[PDB]
Amino acid sequence: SVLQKEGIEISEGTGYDLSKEPGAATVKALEQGTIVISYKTTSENAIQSLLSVGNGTKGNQDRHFHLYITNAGGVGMELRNTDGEFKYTLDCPAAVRGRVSNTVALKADKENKQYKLFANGELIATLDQEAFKFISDITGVDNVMLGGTMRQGTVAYPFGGSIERMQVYRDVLSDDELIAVTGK
Amino acid sequence: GSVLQKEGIEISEGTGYDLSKEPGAATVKALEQGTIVISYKTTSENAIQSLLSVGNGTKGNQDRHFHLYITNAGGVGMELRNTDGEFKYTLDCPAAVRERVSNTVALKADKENKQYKLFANGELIATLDQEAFKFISDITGVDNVMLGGTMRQGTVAYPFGGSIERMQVYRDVLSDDELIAVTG
Numbered sequence: 001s002v003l004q005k006e007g008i009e010i011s012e013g014t015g016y017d018l019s020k021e022p023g024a025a026t027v028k029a030l031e032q033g034t035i036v037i038s039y040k041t042t043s044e045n046a047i048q049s050l051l052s053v054g055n056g057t058k059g060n061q062d063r064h065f066h067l068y069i070t071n072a073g074g075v076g077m078e079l080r081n082t083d084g085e086f087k088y089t090l091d092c093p094a095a096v097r098g099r100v101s102n103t104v105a106l107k108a109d110k111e112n113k114q115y116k117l118f119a120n121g122e123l124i125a126t127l128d129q130e131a132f133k134f135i136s137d138i139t140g141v142d143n144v145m146l147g148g149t150m151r152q153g154t155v156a157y158p159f160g161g162s163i164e165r166m167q168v169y170r171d172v173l174s175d176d177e178l179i180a181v182t183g184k
Numbered sequence: 185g186s187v188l189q190k191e192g193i194e195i196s197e198g199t200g201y202d203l204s205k206e207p208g209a210a211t212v213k214a215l216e217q218g219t220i221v222i223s224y225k226t227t228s229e230n231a232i233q234s235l236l237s238v239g240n241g242t243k244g245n246q247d248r249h250f251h252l253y254i255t256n257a258g259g260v261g262m263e264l265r266n267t268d269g270e271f272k273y274t275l276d277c278p279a280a281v282r283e284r285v286s287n288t289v290a291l292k293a294d295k296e297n298k299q300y301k302l303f304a305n306g307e308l309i310a311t312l313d314q315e316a317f318k319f320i321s322d323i324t325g326v327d328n329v330m331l332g333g334t335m336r337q338g339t340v341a342y343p344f345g346g347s348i349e350r351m352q353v354y355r356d357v358l359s360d361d362e363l364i365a366v367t368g
Contacts, residue, residue: 083257083278090312091268091274092316124314127311128310130280130309130310
């Protein structure tokens with residue numbers, strides 16, 4: 001992993017800044033890679049970012065990436081650099097249990113121009129875009145955080161609970177590894 | 185054969201064009217899968233312009249609809265929604281289309297293969313695979329079909345302006361080669 005955290009408890013609304021951590025610079029420029037997160041939510045917020053990487057400055061609220069969960073057992077991601085540039089999304093319903101640990105992962109595979117989302121030992125969605133993008137295509141990325149997404153200096157999409165384990169890889173893990181690692 | 189077809193329809197921005205009473209509309213309102221092919225010319229700067237929508241126009245049901253849309257930045261996309269707790273499937277492709285010019289786009293929703301594919305001007309531009317495949321028949325309380333907008337609580341949302349030159353809806357799932365040919 002280029003960045004890893006474990007056992008991080010987050011109060012709803014606060015987030016947990018990773019922007020100064022060794023490895024954060026690498027995460028802020030990812031051209032592809034893999035993100036694996038085990039978590040337990042205690043929040044009823046409708047959209048809860050587990051990990052985000054983006055531009056937190058004024059007027060750049062549509063320039064970010066996040067991997068998120070919902071209050072209805074959903075898992076998704078959005079990858080955005082304003083709608084005119086790109087708004088790539090995956091949103092999967094009823095993928096996890098709607099006080100229970102879950103493990104999710106996102107793979108972004110530049111060679112295949114594919115994004116794959118996994119939850120609890122299952123591939124739940126795949127996206128192929130003619131114009132592949134990732135974090136390095138977002139303009140002005142300046143922050144990495146757990147448990148929310150910075151939008152004009154405000155913590156948006158606020159998570160509450162535990163980030164049990166978070167790992168970010170520059171490498172693109174195989175579908176078998178991700179089935180295995182997102183299992184029990 | 186198409187189950188619903190219209191040609192040479194002008195629409196001023198905000199007006200829409202109701203198809204709800206047309207023979208074939210009932211079939212469109214219950215599609216479990218199918219194919220939509222549309223040639224159009226937009227004259228509107230609206231950011232999101234529905235070419236064709238099928239949904240629930242009643243109050244409180246503004247997140248229960250399907251539409252195939254274009255943007256003011258050369259984008260093409262679709263959203264398929266039955267409130268966020270149930271499903272919100274979005275495929276949004278930037279810079280897919282380009283004196284104003286005519287463009288031809290298509291969406292294929294393939295139940296057997298649990299896939300959605302979007303085409304523009306002779307090219308496959310995106311593919312979405314979802315473990316929980318959904319289509320129009322999964323939306324609750326569908327009561328209308330229209331060109332040039334989406335009914336949300338009795339208001340024309342996502343308003344298109346310009347010409348719907350040719351619009352066809354099929355219950356059949358056309359081949360990728362057919363769609364490359366008909367859109368190009």
